[model samples]
Structures are given as structure tokens and as C-alpha cells.
Target: ADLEDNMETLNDNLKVIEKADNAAQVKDALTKMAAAAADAWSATPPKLEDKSPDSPEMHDFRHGFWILIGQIHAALHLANEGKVKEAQAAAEQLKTTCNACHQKYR
Candidate 1:
């Protein structure tokens, strides 16, 4: 598989874990996924979003990706604190990130 497909795989696994009854499972999954991502990137070259973002839409798309990542991480933090609601909301937000990235840049 190409590099992008691996990222999608990780995202799909994340979706599954995110819908767990509470954040405990999801948080653990996120931690695992994070490690996996780290390992993969360590082996392959990174394809960071182009920094120019000459168009406003491009700017938003870039911003959205990072926002989604941050929110998902925040969700894990919330789950750690036993705030399931907030974590789920963050997962929903993360799912939307997949959409935004696919629609704009895929």
C-alpha cells in the first residue's frame, strides 16, 4: 500500500475505538496509534502540508487537519479524566477531519 493508505487504516481503527462506551478504550487506542504513526514516519519520509497555502481554502484545509489531530488528542485527555461526553464529541470532530481532508485534498 502507498503511504496515504496506511494513514487511512490508522484513522479507521481510531474510529472504531472512538465509539467505545467510554474514552478508556479509545484513549488507549489513540496512544497505540500514535506510537504506530511515530514508527512509520521514522521509516518513511514525511509529506507535510505545503506551507504556502496561497489560497484561503487551502489555508483552512491545512488548519482543519491540525485542528482535528489536536481535538482527537484532547479527546484522549478528556477520557483520561473520565469525561466521556467530551471525548466522543472530539471523536466526532475527528471523523469530520477525514471528510474535510478527503474532499479538499484527496
Candidate 2:
């Protein structure tokens, strides 16, 4: 799938996490989010299609993508340990990360 499709998957799973009634559900959602993010990391955004993969802009994009993946793993860890509140907070931070990248690339 394309970057946009993966982004939508991430968004959908995030909403699942938001409304989750238990840590297990949150973990499930986070797992999907992580996969979607990883998929997105492998694909370049349309705006950067003309740039070489090793270009500075692409490097920044890859860096931002890893940050997203890191946050997702952090949240997934919390959820796995049944630390719902902390997991939720980490999930909230995902929004900031997403917006920060979107501001530059989307």
C-alpha cells in the first residue's frame, strides 16, 4: 500500500486505542499501528518522490518515521505491561509526532 493508506491505517488503529476498554485491546491496536507505521517508513511521500532516497529531505523523513515507530513501541510496551494510562499518554504523543511530520511532508 501507499504511504497515505498506511497513514489512514495508523489513524484508524489510534482511534481504536482511544476507545479501548482494556490494555489488551490497546495493545492490539498498537500492534496494528506499529505495522502500519513500519509500512509507511518503507514508502516515500508523494511530495518527496522526485528526491533521491539519500537526499537530506529523505533522511529527515526517515528520521521522523523512526521516531513514530519508537513511540509506537514505547506505547506497546506500556500496554503489554497493563500500564493503560501511560500507554494512553504515549499514544497521545503519537499525535504530536504525526503532526510534526505532516507539517513538513504532508
Candidate 3:
């Protein structure tokens, strides 16, 4: 899938996480989000379509997705352990990472 499709997946799963009442639900949504982030890491954004894959711009863009995937996994780990507060905090951090990347690429 393209970056747009991946982003939609991420957004939809994020909403699931936000409204989830149980750890299993949160874990499921986070698993999907991480998968989307992995897909996004390989997909080029519109803004960087003209840039070479090896270009610094492309590297940074991919790096942002990489970090997001890591954050999602971290949150998923917390959720697996039933650490609700810690998982929620990690989700907050994930949002900040998303916003920071969006500011530059979105």
C-alpha cells in the first residue's frame, strides 16, 4: 500500500486505541498500527517523490516512520503487561512523534 493508505490505517487504529476499554483491544489496535508504520517506512511520501531514495530527505522520512514503529511496539509491550498508565504514556509519545514528522512531511 501507499503512504496515504498506511496513514489511514494508522489513524483508524489510533482511534481504536483511544477509545479502547481493555488491554486486549489496545494491543490489537497497536499491532495494526505497527504494521502500518512498517509499510509506511517503505512507501515514499508525495513531498519526497522527486527525491532519490538515498537522499538525506528520504532517509529522514523513513527514519520518522521507523521511530513511530518503535514507539508503537513499546506501547504494545506495556499493554501486553497490563500496564495501562505506562501504555497510555507511550501512546502520547507516539502522537508527538507523529506530529513532529507531519510538521515536516505532511
Q: What is the TM-score of each candidate against the true structure?
A: 0.59, 0.95, 0.94
Instruction: Estimate the Cα RMSD of every predicted model relative to the unseen true structure.
Output: 5.2, 0.9, 1.0
lDDT of model number 2: 0.89
lDDT of 1: 0.61
- Estimate, for each residue in 3-76, the C-alpha lDDT of model 1 and write its tens digit: 46657666776776756776677777666555444443322224335435455655665565466556657777
Residue by residue across 5-101, what tens digits does model 2's lDDT show? Answer: 8988888988888888899999999999888888877678889999999999999998887999999998999999999888988998889999988
Backbone clash pairs for candidate 2 read none
Name the top lDDT candidate: 2
Candidate 3 to truth, TM: 0.94
**Which candidate has the highest TM-score of all?**
2
Clashes of each: 0, 0, 0
